[PDB]
Amino acid sequence: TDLPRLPFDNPDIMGIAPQMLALQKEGPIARVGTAGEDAWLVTRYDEVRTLLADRRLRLSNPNPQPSAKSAARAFMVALCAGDDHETEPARHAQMRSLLIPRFSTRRLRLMKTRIEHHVDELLDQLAASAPPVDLHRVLSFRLPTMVVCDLLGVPLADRERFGQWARGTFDQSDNEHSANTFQQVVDYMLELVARKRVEPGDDILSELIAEKDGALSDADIAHLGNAVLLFGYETTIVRIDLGTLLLLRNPVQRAQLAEDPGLAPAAVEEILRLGVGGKGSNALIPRYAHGDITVGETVIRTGDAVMLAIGAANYDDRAFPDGGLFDLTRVRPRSHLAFGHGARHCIGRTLARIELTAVFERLFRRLPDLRLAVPEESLRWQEHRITGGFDEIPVTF
Ligand code: HEM
Ligand SMILES: CC1(C)C[C@H]2C=C(C(=O)O)[C@@H]3COC(=O)[C@]4(CO4)[C@]23C1
Structure with a gap:
């Protein structure tokens, strides 16, 4: 008996670590070590989906002496209103109540139109340039930051100011850098809130300022x-990179999609399901048990940490036949x-799907000879950032 320790090694640049698949073959739940507390690791689709719906399993830590966390994880939990287990029910309910109507069908319809034109322009610029090109910098990075500028109602050049702040805030390796980056985010957002109070537009902060006849504080809104x-x-960004790499790996699927862009929605769902990078530490949803929960034979006790491996679950053969295969022709695939x-x-999931669909409708049609300009093995998943990701994707075309 050898206690498995997260993160598990992955000899490939994508997919699930062999040891996590081995645990999944054994059963749905295993006790594992981590860099911090030991945790229950749930790896099969049915059990992960069931626990994600279990109100006893929550983001907030109920423990009296809570384990230490990186500055990055603390910021992420606080942004998600999980930093105080006693106030999480009301604060999280308000958070979703205030965010969900910011992604209305009216807004998503307008943004889809703009996203499509923007991808067209991004790819014209790409096709006219001289290989090798960093696809990450000129495509994957540019479309989602454009979208966020649209949501916030700021000039597009603002993303050159904030484009690295997610990575810096969520740098688990440097608490000082994380805290300094987050202060920049806070300073910028407070500037933006003060501007939208006198110069509102069709954007998210303006709508929150107007919400409940202005009942929200500027700190709440920021x-x-x-x-x-x-x-x-x-x-x-990370999903555009992973989807590009996955399609480059599966030429038959890529050719199907180039021929019929109507397969883009199905390709986007396969990209989301299979898009896991490096050791895939970001394909785990963390939780704490606020009450005892039984998972088949295993009792999760109040206070226990739980890692719900959505990545492993999305590869689960029990839920997806040939779960490791990229397949554009899956009949009625389960929701990943x-x-x-x-x-x-995820509150932004419909918008995120709109972005990925617009890209992969167009990418291999517009650049039919696109391919990596370096070996896959030279692509470097950034394990220290909560959100992982590659720093560059050199291509030719
Ligand atoms: C492909 C891109 C994306 C992926 C893979 C993704 C993934 C996820 C996942 C797995 C969660 C659940 C976390 C948990 O259960 O603790 C989540 C939550 C969330 N996502 Fe997304 N997301 C994406 C894009 C976006 C976008 C574009 C937005 C907004 C513009 C967004 C906003 C949020 C928010 C606010 C939450 C917190 C929900 C809550 O705690 O109630 N996401 N995301
Ligand atoms: C709010 C989040 C950014 C969405 C989720 C997806 C992520 C990712 O794709 O990297 C983040 C990784 O860290 C997590 O705890 C997650 C899995 O919940 C995420 C938090």
Whole structure:
């Protein structure tokens, strides 16, 4: 008997670590070590989906002497209103209540139109340039930051100011850098709130300022805007990179999609399901048990940490036949867990799907000879950032 320790090694640049798949073959739940507390690791689709819907399993830590966390994880939990287990029910309910109507069908319809034109322009610029080109910098990075500028109602050049702040805030390796970056986010957002109070527009902070006849404080409003800024582009960038790499790996699927862009929605769902990078520490949703929960044979006790492996679950053969295969022709595939499930189900997921669909409708049609200009093995998943990701994707075309 050898206690497994997260994170597990992955000899590939994508996919699930072999040891996590081995645990998943054994059963749905295993006790593992981490860099901090030991935790229950749940790796099968059915059990992860069930626990994501279990109101006893929450983000906030109920423990009296809570384990220490990196500055990055503390900021992420506070942005998600999970920093105080006694106030999480009301604060999280208000958070979702205030954020969900900012992504209305009216707004998403307008943004889809703008996103499509912007991808067209981004790809014209790419196709006219001289290889090798960093696809990450000129495509993956540019579309989601454009979108966040649209949501916040700021000039597009602002993303050159804030484009690295998600990475810096969520740098688990440097508490000083994390804290200094977050202060920059706070300073910027407070500037923006004060501007929108006298110069509002069709944007998210203006709507919050107007909300409940102005009942929200500027600190409340900036807090929600920080969540939009820090959650609203970085993970989407990562999915554009992973989707590009996955399609480059599967030429038959890529050719199907180039021929029929109507397969883009199905490709986007396969990209989300299979898009896991490096050791995939970001494909785990963390929780604490606020009450005892039984998982098959295993009792999770109040206070226990739980890692719900949405990545592993999305690869689960029990839920997806040939779960490791990229397949554009899956008949009625189960809903993947890449946006989570239940109480904290991703608020931006419809917008994120709009962005990924617009890209992969166009990418291999516009650049039919696109391919990596370096070996895959030279691509470097950034394990120290909560959101992982590659720093560059050199391509030719
Ligand atoms: C492909 C891109 C994205 C992925 C893979 C993703 C993934 C996720 C996941 C797994 C969660 C659940 C976390 C948990 O259960 O604790 C989540 C929550 C959240 N996401 Fe997304 N997300 C994406 C894009 C976005 C975008 C574009 C926005 C906003 C513009 C956004 C806003 C949020 C917010 C505010 C939450 C917190 C929900 C809550 O705690 O109630 N996300 N995201
Ligand atoms: C709010 C989040 C940015 C969304 C989720 C997706 C992530 C990711 O794709 O990197 C983040 C990684 O860290 C987490 O705890 C997550 C899995 O919940 C995320 C928090």
